[model samples]
Structures are given as structure tokens and as C-alpha cells.
Target: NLPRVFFDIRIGNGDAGRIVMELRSDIVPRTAENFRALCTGERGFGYHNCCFHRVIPQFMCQGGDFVKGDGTGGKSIYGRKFDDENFQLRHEGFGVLSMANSGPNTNGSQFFICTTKCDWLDGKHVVFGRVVDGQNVVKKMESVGSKSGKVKEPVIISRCGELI
Candidate 1:
């Protein structure tokens, strides 16, 4: 059984620096559990790369596909999904965390963090969490990209235990 709830995630590559990202349970409950399971030591998400495959300046940095260890593969933990249907909420804000999807009901393990207001994405996708701190890490990741928008320096994701 899964509980409908929100959680605070401790995110970092296991360095001296660690930031807390808050997940919204109201929108997606099981999704939080999926993420939490990955964060747990039982699973192996922390050791894998975040696959920060896409980077757009002052917009967002997307990552989290656990398939090929790159930007390919990996299926959504909740299987296929439809838009969360937030008629009231839109995707126009920074620090907002949302699931990245290639098509409808195709969201798997990919997610992105917004750096600035982006109202365009509202209602089209589901908003899950927000970055409470460590905005510099996002900035640093944006600086390292090639023609393909992939950063040269790989961003490693470590499973930092969460209190929630």
C-alpha cells in the first residue's frame, strides 16, 4: 500500500554540499515513493549518473533517466501517465520540479528543475518538487554544454538519505 504524501529529499553527489528538494505529494503521491525508493540505499540511484542530458540557460536543467545511464532508456516508475490536470496551476516559476516526458503517458525516470519562470509548461506536465537551496549547482551545470546541450562535465547524482 502507498500513502499519499510529500517528502523532503536530500540531494547531492555525496559531497560537502547538500541541498534539500521538496516534493509535492498533492500532485503525485506514488511518484514520491518511487523517488524515495531510489534514494534509499536498497536501490542504486545515487551511484548512477543523473544524465543531465539537456541544459537551457535561464530555463531548466533536465536529467534523471536511469536506463542507459545516459539520456535514453528508463521507464516511468508509475508506468504511463496522463497530465495531472492543474487548471489552476501553471508552469511559470523557478525552483519548480517537474517530470520530463517525451510524449503523453511516457514519463519514466526523467525530471527537470527550472531556473526561471516558465508558465508555458503549466498544465502540460506535472509539478512535483522545488529546489530549496543549492541553486549554484544548477548554474554550474548550465555552463558545461556542447552543441548537443550536453555538459562536458558529467553531473553525478548520489542517493542522499531523506528524513521525510
Candidate 2:
């Protein structure tokens, strides 16, 4: 069975709203566990209060840099970066959640939610989950800012943790 995890992600500046997401732990165990740990603060640091450092409309919104508000920092529950989980899932449609990395075997705490189809990233990113609710929040998140994918006011994740 797939484990369900939830997040109440918020963008508190303009039209800020709460975006709820449910994660899947069955398909990509390691990746999901990493995200879950970050959400639940099991790592001492969590996604709560983290900012969406990169926002690429018609593409994806990346975040989870708990250590630094910027996109260059984050840590896994393992205390360090880890290898990529199986790219066993496809980024076939919108609302697809996956791990972000510099290259192969560089999975960490950073993740992105696809706002549109991203077939090009099929084997590159580890697809962990999809948005089960709050598509409007995702859309609003995509429209937070413009130019070079940086949110002008920064969409912050006010609270993130397991749903059940």
C-alpha cells in the first residue's frame, strides 16, 4: 500500500494560499521518506518555513531548502545527500512531485512540483508523488513571480507534515 503524506504549503505575500499535497511512499521509498522526514521535522530541520526558491511557470516550482532559503542547500534524513531512487515513475502530467539534484546520485531535500507535463525529465528526476488536492494552490504558486523563475516575494511553506 502507498503511504500518504500531506503538506500545507503556503505562499504568504500576494494572493497567498495554502496548497495541500499528498505524497506516495510506495513507488519511491527513499525519496518519499526523505520528503516525509523533512515535512515532519524528523531531521531537526524541515520544510516548514522553507521558501520556494525557484518558480518556473508552465513547468515546475522547486523548494525544500530548509537549511538555506536559497536553492543550494538541503539535507536528507540520512544526514547527507544520497543516490537517486529508481526513476520508476513518469512525470507524465501536471502536479508531479520529484526530487531535484545536480546530477546522478545527488538526491537531497530539494524537490519540485511539475505544473505541466515534463516528459523530458522521465529518467532524470525521481518521481515520488503527485498533488492529490489543491491544484488551485499549485497554479497560484506558479504565478507568484516572473522572470528567471524567481518568486518576487518568495512562496513560503508555512507548515508541512504528514496527513495521517
Candidate 3:
């Protein structure tokens, strides 16, 4: 069975709601496990308090910079960065979850959830998971950000964990 994870988000001073995602470990074992472990925080640190720093309507919502809370910093369980597991999983449609990297195998803790289909990103980023629930907050988040991906209030991953 695949692993499922969740994030309880807070927008500005209010509750944004929960987002549940399912990881495809069968395709990208390391990549999926990386995200899974981050949720559980068994390594002593996790995505808790991390904020989605970038969001572009008709595109995707990006975050997971657990170190900086901005687009500038993040660290994977495997140190600071890891390899691109594979591109077998396609970004076929909306709600696709994939890694955000600088260029080539530079993936860290940063990731994005597709608000729209992004075919251009295929083979460049590791497609690790998909949003299975919380379309409400996902739509709400798409409304909160700017065209430039900035927002007036911060959207935070107030809490995260596995279903068990």
C-alpha cells in the first residue's frame, strides 16, 4: 500500500484546513520515503511551521522550505539535497505533487502541488505524490496568492503527520 500524509495549514491568523496527499513509493521509493519521513518528523525536524512561499493561479502551490520559510532554504532527510528519483510518473493533471528544484538533481525539501496541469515540468522534477483531499483549501490558497506568487498573509504548515 502507498503512504498517505497530511498537513494542517494556517493562513495568516486563521485556519486554512487540512491537505491529504498520497505518495507513490512504488515508482519513486526514495523520493516518496523522503516526503513521508518529513511528515512524521522522525528525524527530529519536519515540515512543521514551513509555509507555502509561492503560489501561482492556474499553475501550482509551492512550499516546504522548513529551514527558511521562504523559497531560499530547505533540507531533505538525505542531507540538504537528493537525486531526482524518476520521471515515470507524469504530471498528467491538477493536484499532482512534485519536487521543486533549482536545476537538475537539486531537490531538497521544497515541493509543489499542481493547481493546473503542468506538462512543461515533466522529466525535470520528481513527481512523488498527489493531493487526494482538501480541494477546498487548495482552491482557497490559489485565491490568496499573487500572480507573482507572493501573498499578503503567510500560509503555514501548522502541523503534519501520517495517518497510521
lDDT of 1 at 82: 39
Name the TM-score of candidate 3. Answer: 0.97
lDDT of each: 0.59, 0.80, 0.89
Q: What is residue 156's positional error in candidate 1, in angstroms?
A: 1.0
Decoy 1 TM-score against native: 0.74
Q: Give the lDDT of residue 68 in candidate 3.
A: 83
> Local error of candidate 1 at 92, Å?
3.2
Candidate 1 lDDT for residue 58: 82
lDDT of 2 by residue, 6-76 (tens): 55656664545555565667777777788878888876887888888888888888988878779888888
The residue pairs found clashing in candidate 3 are none
Cα lDDT tens digits, model 3, 1-164, are 99999999998888989999999999999999889999999998889888899988878899999898888988989989888878999898988999999999898999999887898899898899899999778878876788998876889899999985
Instruction: Using lDDT, give the best candidate's number.
Output: 3
RMSD to truth, every model: 4.8, 1.7, 0.9
Candidate 2 accuracy as TM-score? 0.91
RMSD of 3: 0.9
User: What's the lDDT for residue 36 in model 3?
Assistant: 92
Ranking by TM-score: 3, 2, 1
Best by TM-score: 3
